[PDB]
Amino acid sequence: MRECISIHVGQAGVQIGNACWELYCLEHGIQPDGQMPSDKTIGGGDDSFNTFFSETGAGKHVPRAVFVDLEPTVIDEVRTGTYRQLFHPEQLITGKEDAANNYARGHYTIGKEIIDLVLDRIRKLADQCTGLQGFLVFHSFGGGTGSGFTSLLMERLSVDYGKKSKLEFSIYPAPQVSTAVVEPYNSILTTHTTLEHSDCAFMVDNEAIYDICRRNLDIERPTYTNLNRLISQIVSSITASLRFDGALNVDLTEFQTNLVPYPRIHFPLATYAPVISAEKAYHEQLSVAEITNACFEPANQMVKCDPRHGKYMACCLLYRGDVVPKDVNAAIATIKTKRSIQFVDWCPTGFKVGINYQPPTVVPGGDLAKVQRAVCMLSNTTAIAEAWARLDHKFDLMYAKRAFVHWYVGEGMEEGEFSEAREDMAALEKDYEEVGVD
């Protein structure tokens, strides 16, 4: 058994972290007070769920998580919320004034004054780990804290835990649920200084989650609660193999091995189905083929793009529910003859399949409906570079006029880091076209 520490940075990180740990408890049968009647080894144990939950002598199961936000209002919710008893105060960290959507402010001005503290809190959880694997970091691209402080943390983690893996769950900015005009700046600033420090990063485009909530859940104007309940479902699928007995993606290292043959191309595309509305009178349960076929529809991808016009470097199918291997292969062979799945010549055309028999759990009263079987596909497409292209385009439009640049220079950042970060993106886009274009 090897432990995994979750780090939630900024509002988006903390609130999404709240949704996941809510789901984790409902799945592993851990009540809001931390008690777990099924854990027959009180005060300890080396089980699968122990990779995410520490144990006290009293039998409480404490998440191996740290929450960090430069403004105390979002984490004060956790301190007085349903699951307030899950975490001890050391795990929740907050400042006084935030980064104001200013990467430089979160990285330099405010970050420099709280970086050594967060590390000391992580060090406390690491000491409880007998074989730490790495970290899972949740944050937004657009926020001043999620972008600025995260990248500073990622550098320190590489220095203090150089032998440990790091996975990111990053919220890509969407104008429909965002009001900060400078989020393209922060997105590209944080990707530049964080690139060489991340092993595997799952991007979630808020525009994708937003459209799925309106199209599949019939939420006319979705809220962060709707978005985060859905996001944590995908996160649960991705982290299930670390928390449950199995053989595929058993440790954080396996995520890089199976999804990242090229180090700089470490952004897998996530696709999830089915998303059914709980308010629906009653849905006909979809089959293995129908949900597996749905994995190649852009309308259920975490990032809108067209994989038909890229090349695959790796493809991983993670099923939860009543699924047998026989049906999976029967659907794959049906999709190869219909879909356009081009693999890179230096990669084998194949799929790694994981099946967990326990079907997805749904938060009582949430928006999602109980389904008999669900799948999450993790595919490494060169088509995800479309999202970098969109983001780069907005960056160039503003940087050409130096719009808003004075806010960053005023926080001690040098203008040069802009073009330095942008050039790194031009390099990232050149690697993608070398891989999936003839």
């Binding site: 006084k96 004034e97 104001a100 959507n101 200013n102 104008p175 429909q176 965002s178 009001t179 900060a180 005009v181 400078v182 393209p184 006319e220 104007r221 907005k394 439009l397 503003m398 050409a400 006029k401 719009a403 808003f404 004075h406 806010w407």
Partner: protein
């Protein structure tokens, strides 16, 4: 606990500030004696942003009333919500400023400023986390204009990293007290260009035309004009006074509204303005909000381009319909929005509408069309300055022509700056 210290200086500043606190106090459920008698917790949620909490559950505005003559503040303390202001927070002199910027900024104002800073320092020290300061004042007089900018430059020295916002009433010959208003207004604009993060330009000519043409008021008064300023000050600060998401604090609003440091002068807009029981649809709120007639800077936005826009809709409406109409206005007029700032129109919703309105919309625009406001002042300025007319009022207070030339040059540069970005 992100507190804001409010300051109101001079005749116009205190008459408008008084009305402002009268409006929001009613929205937050505070009676004239500072007792809360509301029915919704949303009111008290962010109440500490503008109000302190005294013994006995009392709420006392975090406001400082400043003037060089006692006449106006005596009326406030005798007005409706007069008893609500902290008695110590009244700082006034007896000399007066005689509508003279030099007197407010260099002589009469210098004598009184130190005692005003003692009150600012007292209000800030009690703040768990001071956001910044907001100042209501006119630019055409002496105290609000001359001493107002003196307070800004002195408060900046003591809290250099906080945020400084102003509601600044610009003079117009159509609504004029003295001929020297362009002199004072030009001298102040120079200060504001360098020392504030955000300035809401409130043109008395726009307010006048709206009262006469739209509201059908034959003989507008300062009282009528201050009604529009109240409704607008309430609208533009809704983001700060209630539980919200975008532009929640002063620094965040500034980051999304100010792409270039010197270009921080906004055109406020409010809707509706009825001359009254009929319901106003969401499309109507949007068409009026962006229509020039509803704008209070007296600058036709069709003359320039919007760098950034902040919209706020108050009331129980269709947030889905709000997003539709907003996207509709932008998509139907994308030639008046700079195309090199993606997604520069941000919209916010608030469930608490202003008193007596089912719903309303407040509009915050950073448009290059504001340059025509500074053109009016510059033309009026140079008309007298080329003959050095009325300068003796200022030179007699220790000033020199060179100081006037400098202020004039800085405002013309401000205009040329807006002009280059308009193309």
């Amino acid at each position: 606990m992100r507190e804001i210290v409010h300051i109101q200086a001079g005749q116009c500043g205190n008459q408008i500030g008084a009305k402002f606190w009268e409006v929001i106090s009613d929205e937050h459920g505070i009676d004239p004696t500072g007792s809360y008698h509301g029915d919704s917790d949303l009111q008290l949620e962010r109440i500490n942003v503008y109000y302190n909490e005294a013994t006995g559950n009392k709420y006392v505005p975090r406001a400082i009333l400043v003037d060089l003559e006692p006449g106006t503040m005596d009326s406030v303390r005798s007005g409706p919500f007069g008893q609500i202001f902290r008695p110590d927070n009244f700082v006034f002199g007896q000399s007066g400023a005689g509508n003279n910027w030099a007197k407010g900024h260099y002589t009469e104002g210098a004598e009184l400023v130190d005692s005003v800073l003692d009150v600012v320092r007292k209000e800030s020290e009690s703040c768990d986390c001071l956001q910044g300061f907001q100042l209501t004042h006119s630019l055409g007089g002496g105290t609000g204009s001359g001493m107002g900018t003196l307070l800004i430059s002195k408060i900046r020295e003591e809290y250099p990293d906080r945020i400084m916002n102003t509601f600044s009433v610009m003079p117009s010959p159509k609504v004029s007290d003295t001929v020297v208003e362009p002199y004072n207004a030009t001298l102040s604009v120079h200060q504001l260009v360098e020392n504030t993060d955000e300035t809401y330009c409130i043109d008395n000519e726009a307010l006048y035309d709206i009262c006469f043409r739209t509201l059908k008021l034959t003989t507008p008064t300062y009282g009528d004009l201050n009604h529009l300023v109240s409704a607008t000050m309430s609208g533009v600060t809704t983001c700060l006074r209630f539980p919200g998401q975008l532009n929640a604090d002063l620094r965040k609003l500034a980051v999304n509204m100010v792409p270039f440091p010197r270009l921080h002068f906004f055109m406020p807009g409010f809707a509706p303005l009825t001359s009254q029981y009929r319901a106003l649809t969401v499309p109507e709120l949007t068409q009026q909000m962006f229509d020039s007639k509803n704008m209070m800077a007296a600058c036709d936005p069709r003359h320039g381009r919007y760098l950034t826009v902040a919209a706020i809709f108050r009331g129980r409406m269709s947030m889905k319909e709000v997003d539709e109409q907003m996207l509709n206005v932008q998509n139907k007029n994308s030639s008046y929005f700079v195309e090199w700032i993606p997604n520069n129109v941000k919209t916010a919703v608030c469930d608490i509408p202003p008193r007596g309105l089912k719903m309303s919309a407040t509009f915050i625009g950073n448009s290059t069309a504001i340059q025509e406001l500074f053109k009016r002042i510059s033309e009026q300025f140079t008309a007298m300055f080329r003959r050095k007319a009325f300068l003796h009022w200022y030179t007699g207070e220790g000033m020199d022509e060179m100081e006037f030339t400098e202020a004039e040059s800085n405002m013309n540069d401000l205009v040329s700056e807006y002009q280059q970005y308009q193309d």
